[PDB]
Amino acid sequence: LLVPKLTASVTDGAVGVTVDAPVSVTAADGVLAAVTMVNDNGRPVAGRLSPDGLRWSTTEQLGYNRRYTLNATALGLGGAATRQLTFQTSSPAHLTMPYVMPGDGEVVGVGEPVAIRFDENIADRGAAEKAIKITTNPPVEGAFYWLNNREVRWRPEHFWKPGTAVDVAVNTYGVDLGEGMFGEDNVQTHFTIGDEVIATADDNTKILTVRVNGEVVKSMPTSMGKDSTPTANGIYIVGSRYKHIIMDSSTYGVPVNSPNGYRTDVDWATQISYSGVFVHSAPWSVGAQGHTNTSHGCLNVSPSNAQWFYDHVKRGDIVEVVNTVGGTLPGIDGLGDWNIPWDQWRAGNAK
Numbered sequence: 001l002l003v004p005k006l007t008a009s010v011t012d013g014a015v016g017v018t019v020d021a022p023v024s025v026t027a028a029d030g031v032l033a034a035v036t037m038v039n040d041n042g043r044p045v046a047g048r049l050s051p052d053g054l055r056w057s058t059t060e061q062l063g064y065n066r067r068y069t070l071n072a073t074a075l076g077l078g079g080a081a082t083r084q085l086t087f088q089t090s091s092p093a094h095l096t097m098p099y100v101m102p103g104d105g106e107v108v109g110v111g112e113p114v115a116i117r118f119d120e121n122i123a124d125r126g127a128a129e130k131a132i133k134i135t136t137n138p139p140v141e142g143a144f145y146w147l148n149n150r151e152v153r154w155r156p157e158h159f160w161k162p163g164t165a166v167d168v169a170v171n172t173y174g175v176d177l178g179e180g181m182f183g184e185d186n187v188q189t190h191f192t193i194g195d196e197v198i199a200t201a202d203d204n205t206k207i208l209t210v211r212v213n214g215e216v217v218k219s220m221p222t223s224m225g226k227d228s229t230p231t232a233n234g235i236y237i238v239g240s241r242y243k244h245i246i247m248d249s250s251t252y253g254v255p256v257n258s259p260n261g262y263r264t265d266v267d268w269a270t271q272i273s274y275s276g277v278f279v280h281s282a283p284w285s286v287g288a289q290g291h292t293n294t295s296h297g298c299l300n301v302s303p304s305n306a307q308w309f310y311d312h313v314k315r316g317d318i319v320e321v322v323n324t325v326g327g328t329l330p331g332i333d334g335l336g337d338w339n340i341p342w343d344q345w346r347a348g349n350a351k
């Protein structure tokens with residue numbers, strides 16, 4: 001007859017045990033008769049034993065900077081075996097919390113990237129990407145690209161197909177993200193791609209044309225950026241929308257008392273770049289809309305068309321600006337991700 005054997009997922013005397021996975025104990029040639037795990041001061045850790053008695057596992061989150069002691073006894077026909085193991089978990093220098101966009105259960109447009117923003121700089125971008133699990137249905141190829149030291153984006157080559165489910169599991173708890181920085185917790189979100197909505201502003205006609213699944217539903221006279229402060233050409237992702245908002249130039253880097261500065265309250269404003277480009281109500285330029293450019297870069301439209309845009313365009317929908325005398329919107333604006341060529345995006349920048 002054989003004496004039972006105990007196998008644990010940790011070793012006695014281990015340090016830096018990562019807390020991104022449960023701790024388990026398994027019995028062979030016998031079953032687990034007693035398993036307890038206790039922290040540095042007596043408190044039991046929640047666990048569960050399998051019905052067949054062969055495997056025990058922790059069932060709650062294990063902590064950073066803990067000294068745990070595991071006691072297990074296996075019994076079989078051939079006798080008994082008991083082991084005691086003590087180990088120490090990861091000791092982070094710092095924690096970082098991820099924040100994910102878009103919201104859980106939201107329906108968004110075909111241009112919405114997966115966004116994960118950490119509240120600290122990430123030293124090991126590769127470890128962060130490896131810890132993020134993206135599921136798509138129908139499955140589509142996508143890739144990670146960093147906009148800055150804190151925020152990474154994931155998207156396909158082309159705009160999402162309507163009806164696509166997207167699941168984002170940010171499994172950063174217990175993960176070393178470089179230089180002693182560990183994930184504060186896991187986060188999760190799930191969203192769905194809705195109708196294809198692409199609004200094109202053509203400087204040659206000064207009309208913003210809204211197409212839904214390829215059909216024109218709206219044609220808005222617009223006044224874009226004057227020659228000296230033009231609207232950049234390119235693909236813009238629709239972000240947040242406001243029934244009214246105070247536009248403060250210092251938010252976007254420019255003092256109000258400055259020459260190019262401003263602080264003005266405007267109605268029905270849909271944001272389309274982090275640099276502060278909005279579609280919004282401009283009752284003062286209705287005469288110019290459809291004829292001449294007069295703005296600081298915004299897409300000025302009529303009050304009723306701005307409210308229409310607010311009501312009918314959603315986060316993740318697309319605005320494309322073409323034929324202006326401006327440059328191209330920066331790929332790393334915040335809402336300019338589609339201006340980065342796919343070969344460059346797919347190659348990534350985790351180094």
Ligand SMILES: C[C@@H]1[C@H]([C@H](C=O)[C@@H](C)O)N=C(C(=O)O)[C@@H]1SCC(=O)OC1CCCCC1
Binds near residue numbers: 262284294298299
């Ligand atoms: C600055 C605002 C905004 C801008 C994007 O272009 C932000 C979002 O970066 N677009 C504007 C525009 O209308 O083009 C404003 S101009 C600020 C002002 O002095 O407002 C008065 C001027 C005209 C008379 C009534 C308001």
